């Protein structure tokens, strides 16, 4: 009898660890069933896929920079001197059964992970979920975006191919060596000397697989622990007040819905990792300081920084026999953007003047200023992301070769203002649409 | 609250309500999905859910089969088995993604068509604690501090702060004391003693009068022997990536020569682009203060490393005499001492003086008159 066995196991568990009171509270937890509340579920599920596929990749990856001669099965690269990182990356794709499938799934999972965070960030931003008491959860989440910002960048550079090798020379060195007073000291401490050095990949590999994921896992655990004990908010509606949660219980509606949603994420990621080819490293060969690939092609999560570099004017300062290159503006801009993003609720509660407990999500149309600001930020981010494909864009109108950066350099003040005005007017119109 | 006697006769329906009441959960609405059993619509829905679940099992079995019995080895382009190899990875993701996607689809359709609809309201006790847990925890923490009498013992408190601070400063200083390296510690032997890494490159003479050839790479740089360059080894309107090669560096036939040649290619400031301007274009040529006599006739030598962020600029338009860096799209007017015209570049590319030795192969007349590569705080 299966029922008898379950009763015996339940009696044994209860008589040892008396979890009946604690388990019942967990099973009775109520979560809202809004569609936009699954945005954070995708980011968490994508992180799990990255954990599983990342462990598989470490069984065949050598993070060494030692020069070796290729001797695999790839004809076009036979006899080409390369590093151990590039050779083992080629070994995974070609000489390991299913290695290419896992490698493409892992890269696709990283993109979905990064995309989900940004889309989930907008949901928190637009609905005003960063208010009290969830102000500290925004800070923890903001740090997770920054950690995932560099985590994807480091992993993309692990194969040490020509494309990624140029992105660790254009960003991790020129911008780091261009910092005032203590700029070449950091570059020396992070590469162990000059570029490329011999401890670039091994140091990044240790950071990328363990140290950064360890902080991310700890922050995610604290993030999920907060939301579980903060009794996640809900949209205003019939029967929804500030002192109640309307939705479904964990067992069995939420558990099945949440668990089956994990299956779709794996299925979508698995389908994209087999049918869609991403990051073909064998086409351009190993990274060499002598030769160069056309672009420093990054993924879209770490692409807005490259667009800002090209669009920013060549402004440099030379105070008293020194040099402040153009890369300082990009690095400073990242600091200002990250600082503003992290301390957003604290600024909002200073200008709006409200410091009361909030549990019902604000409608985005109810706050036209915040909605317009968010739309302006999204439009600015999209323009910066699309600013680094100017090579393709230039060969579309054939009116001037250097006029594509002028569109970008002028459009950084005109287009965001246009989006801000349209969003502001649309929010007001929607307020009076049903009133 | 109820005793064991009452719980004996309680049904499962009211037992769930009692459990929710303790936790503050009130199930205000719950209805079975199919009010009438045995209807054809319910039976049809059961088959549809089972069909999705059975698809996952069939696709899961296919994944095991395609992984084992299928040509997976890499095949060269244009081969008899190249087409089969190109379908290996897509079949791996098609039979795996669809196997679990259909399972998730079937499970969701099961909880939207068979698990009864329920909406439950849980009273959230947000805000401050009910004034009895607040006072007790405040007294518990205050009693520990007041009972320990640490506040009234200043000598112990000051020593603890200084002792922990001194230990922390030493520990943190000894924890990040191995990562700090002086960037200006003379380590590269040059003609004049030892200089720092940034001030030097592959073209820096190790002794007075050292001969460095603008050698061309027969194949891939660092993997093929370097060959010397004749002045007329490039037609008017071309470009060659020369590297600093010495006569003692060998041709890579030995391990010590191969290591020397590898370091030449791995040099971040080593590559230099050689450009020859047509004789009918020297009227519109502007020199640089200090580099007026650096060119040799119609031959100009400029570093391949971009001055903005260090990307090796390989693209070059012979029609406009423009050097294009492919990373951030910066053009460098070769006629105006490789000065950056457009883009984020702000400093002109360094010019390497060149001349001709007794033999006749292009040699470097000396070192750069300015640091090569991206600018830093201590530059110029």
């Amino acid at each position: 009898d299966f029922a008898k066995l379950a009763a015996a196991q339940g009696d044994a568990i209860d008589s040892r660890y008396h979890p009946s009171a604690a388990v019942r509270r967990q099973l009775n937890k109520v979560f809202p069933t809004h569609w936009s509340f699954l945005l954070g579920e995708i980011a968490l599920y994508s992180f799990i896929i990255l954990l599983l596929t990342g462990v598989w990749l470490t069984l065949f990856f050598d993070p060494s920079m030692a020069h070796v001669t290729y001797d695999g099965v790839y004809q076009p690269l036979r006899g080409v001197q390369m590093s151990r990182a590039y050779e083992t990356a080629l070994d995974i794709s070609f000489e390991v059964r299913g290695g290419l499938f896992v490698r493409q799934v892992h890269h696709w999972a990283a993109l979905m992970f990064a995309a989900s965070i940004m889309v989930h960030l907008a949901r928190i931003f637009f609905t005003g979920a960063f208010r009290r008491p969830r102000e500290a959860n925004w800070v923890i989440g903001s740090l997770l975006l920054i950690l995932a910002m560099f985590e994807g960048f480091f992993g993309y550079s692990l194969p040490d191919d020509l494309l990624s090798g140029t992105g660790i020379r254009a960003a991790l060195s020129g911008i780091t060596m261009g910092i005032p007073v203590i700029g070449t000291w950091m570059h020396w401490a992070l590469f162990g000397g000059d570029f490329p050095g011999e401890i670039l990949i091994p140091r990044l590999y240790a950071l990328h697989i363990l140290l950064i994921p360890g902080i991310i896992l700890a922050l995610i655990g604290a993030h999920l622990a907060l939301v579980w004990f903060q009794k996640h908010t809900q949209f205003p509606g019939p029967g929804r007040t500030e002192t109640n949660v309307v939705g479904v219980r964990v067992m069995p509606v939420f558990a099945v819905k949440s668990g089956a949603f994990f299956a779709m994420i794996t299925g979508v990621l698995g389908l994209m990792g087999g049918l869609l080819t991403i990051n073909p490293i064998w086409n351009l060969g190993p990274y060499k300081p002598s030769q160069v690939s056309a672009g420093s092609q990054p993924d879209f999560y770490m692409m807005w920084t490259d667009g800002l570099i090209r669009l920013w004017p060549a402004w440099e300062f030379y105070p008293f026999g020194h040099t402040i290159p153009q890369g300082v503006w990009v690095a400073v801009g990242m600091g200002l953007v990250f600082a503003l993003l992290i301390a957003y609720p604290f600024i909002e509660k200073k200008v709006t003047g409200d410091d009361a407990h909030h549990n019902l999500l604000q409608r985005p149309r109810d706050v036209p200023v915040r909605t317009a600001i968010g739309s302006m930020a999204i439009a600015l981010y999209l323009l910066l992301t699309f600013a680094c494909m100017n090579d393709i864009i230039a060969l579309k109108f054939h009116i001037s070769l250097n006029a594509t950066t002028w569109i970008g350099r002028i459009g950084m003040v005109v287009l965001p203002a246009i989006v801000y005005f349209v969003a502001y007017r649309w929010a007001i119109s929607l307020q009076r649409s049903d009133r | 609250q109820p005793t064991d006697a009452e719980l004996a006769e309680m049904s499962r329906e009211e037992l769930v309500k009692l459990g929710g009441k303790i936790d503050g959960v009130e199930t205000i609405f719950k209805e079975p999905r199919w009010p009438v059993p045995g209807t054809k619509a319910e039976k049809r829905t059961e088959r549809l859910v089972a069909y999705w679940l059975m698809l996952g099992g069939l696709s899961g079995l296919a994944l095991l089969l395609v992984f084992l019995f299928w040509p997976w080895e890499y095949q060269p382009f244009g081969s008899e088995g190249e087409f089969l190899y190109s379908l290996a990875t897509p079949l791996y993701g098609l039979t795996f993604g669809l196997s679990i996607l259909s399972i998730g689809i079937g499970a969701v359709l099961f909880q939207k068509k068979f698990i009864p609809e329920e909406i439950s309201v849980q009273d959230r006790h947000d805000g401050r604690s009910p004034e009895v847990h607040r006072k007790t925890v405040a007294a518990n923490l205050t009693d520990a501090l007041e009972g320990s009498t640490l506040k009234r013992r200043k000598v112990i408190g000051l020593s603890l702060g200084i002792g922990l601070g001194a230990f922390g400063a030493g520990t943190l200083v000894a924890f990040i004391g191995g990562l700090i390296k002086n960037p200006w510690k003379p380590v590269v032997p040059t003609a004049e003693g030892k200089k720092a890494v940034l001030w030097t490159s592959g073209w820096t003479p190790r002794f007075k009068g050292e001969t460095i050839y603008l050698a061309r790479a027969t194949g891939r740089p660092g993997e093929s022997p370097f060959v010397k360059m004749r002045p007329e080894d490039i037609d008017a309107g071309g470009m060659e990536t020369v590297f600093p090669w010495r006569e003692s560096d060998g041709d890579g036939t030995t391990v010590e020569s191969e290591h020397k040649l590898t370091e030449i290619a791995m040099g971040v400031r080593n590559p230099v682009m050689l450009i020859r301007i047509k004789p009918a274009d020297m009227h519109r040529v502007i020199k640089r203060k200090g580099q007026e006599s650096f060119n040799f006739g119609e031959l100009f030598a400029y570093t391949k490393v971009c001055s903005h962020l260090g990307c090796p600029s390989s693209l070059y338009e012979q029609q406009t005499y423009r050097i294009l860096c492919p990373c951030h799209q910066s053009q460098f007017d070769a006629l105006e001492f490789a000065k950056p015209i457009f883009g984020p570049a702000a400093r002109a590319l360094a010019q390497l003086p060149i001349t001709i030795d007794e033999d006749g192969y292009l040699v470097a007349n000396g070192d750069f008159v300015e640091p090569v590569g991206p600018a830093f705080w201590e530059r110029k």
Binding site: - | G209, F296, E336, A348, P353, I354, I356, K380
Partner: peptide
């Protein structure tokens, strides 16, 4: 601002001499 050590000049220049090559490397 503009780079101080980067100024154009109108000096014509002279043809470089033949390199000799010092001995004793």
């Amino acid at each position: 601002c503009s780079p101080p050590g980067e100024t154009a000049s109108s000096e014509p220049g002279t043809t470089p001499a033949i390199w000799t090559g010092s001995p004793s490397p």
